Amino acid sequence: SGLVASNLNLKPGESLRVRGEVAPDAKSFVLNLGKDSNNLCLHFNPRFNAHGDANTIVSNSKDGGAWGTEQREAVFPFQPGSVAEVSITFDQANLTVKLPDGYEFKFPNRLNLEAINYMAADGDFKIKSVAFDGSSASGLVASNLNLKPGESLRVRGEVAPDAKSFVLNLGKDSNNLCLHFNPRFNAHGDANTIVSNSKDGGAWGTEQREAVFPFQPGSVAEVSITFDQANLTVKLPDGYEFKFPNRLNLEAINYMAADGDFKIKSVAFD
Ligand SMILES: OC[C@H]1O[C@@H](O[C@H]2[C@H](O)[C@@H](O)[C@@H](O)O[C@@H]2CO)[C@H](O)[C@@H](O)[C@H]1O
Ligand SMILES: OC[C@H]1O[C@@H](O[C@H]2[C@H](O)[C@@H](O)[C@H](O)O[C@@H]2CO)[C@H](O)[C@@H](O)[C@H]1O
Secondary structure (H helix, E strand, O other): OOOEEEOOOEOOOOEEEEEEEEOOOOOEEEEEEEEEOOEEEEEEEEEEEEOOEEEEEEEEEEEOOEEOOOEEOOOOOOOOOEEEEEEEEOOOOEEEEEOOOOOEEEEEOOOOOOOEOEEEEEEOEEEEEEEEOOOOOOOOEEEOOOEOOOOEEEEEEEEOOOOOEEEEEEEEEOOEEEEEEEEEEEEOOEEEEEEEEEEEOOEEOOOEEOOOOOOOOOOEEEEEEEOOOOEEEEEOHHHOEEEEEOOOOOOOEOEEEEEEOEEEEEEEEO
């Protein structure tokens, strides 16, 4: 199992674009989309050699844990040991899935979900990035990460025109953060101040504040965070970096949550 993206708000007409690596010995992979793990508007399952299928896409819904009627396509534009991109557009009547070869297909919204709040990846596909339309990842929670020492995540977003604050939290869970990263445009009596902190068993550590503030209301921004056991390296927009001490005993980052006045356009996992 890989990434579980939750707290999404993919509204009708909006898409997510998942790019990943198909394993050299791929048998099967899954992208599960919907409300939660039990309530899927799309179980998208390319089966290379699994479940009685060879080189066949199987799609289904999952309602209260129950599988529905399966749909199989003829096209199979996936190859072990290659990069593939899959786009899923949410809509009220039908989802649209766009595959690597140009091919598209429809899958009915049977649960009549209002939005996609949840995407999980499983099987023989290593997610490299997820890209999001509109404000669908504004509250993104990325769980079941396994960001090991030396590994980075890259967040690209648009700061809101009237932005007060945004946050990127990285650690084990919401109470155990090796980095709470908090650019404050105008929040908690700080103006244009980056505040960083740890959180250990729910308790805030000692803040670190930066001098530079390479963010602007309304501007796109890219932030990269590299996890190492001693320090995290934060690559701020436009060629600035700083380090933040890792004050927790985590040996990997399993959790990233984004909130506030930053519309996440993509997350990439290096
Ligand atoms: O340390 C991160 C958290 O800060 C909280 O605000 C602090 C503030 O930064 C500090 O100057 C002092 O006044 O105490 C406040 C309360 O701990 C935020 O409220 C919180 O959201 C985090 O950003
Ligand atoms: O529907 C998705 C679901 O399929 C299950 O396997 C099915 C299989 O696809 C079908 O051809 C066969 O007749 O029944 C199987 C269930 O007994 C998988 O087990 C599950 O993981 C999903 O992929």
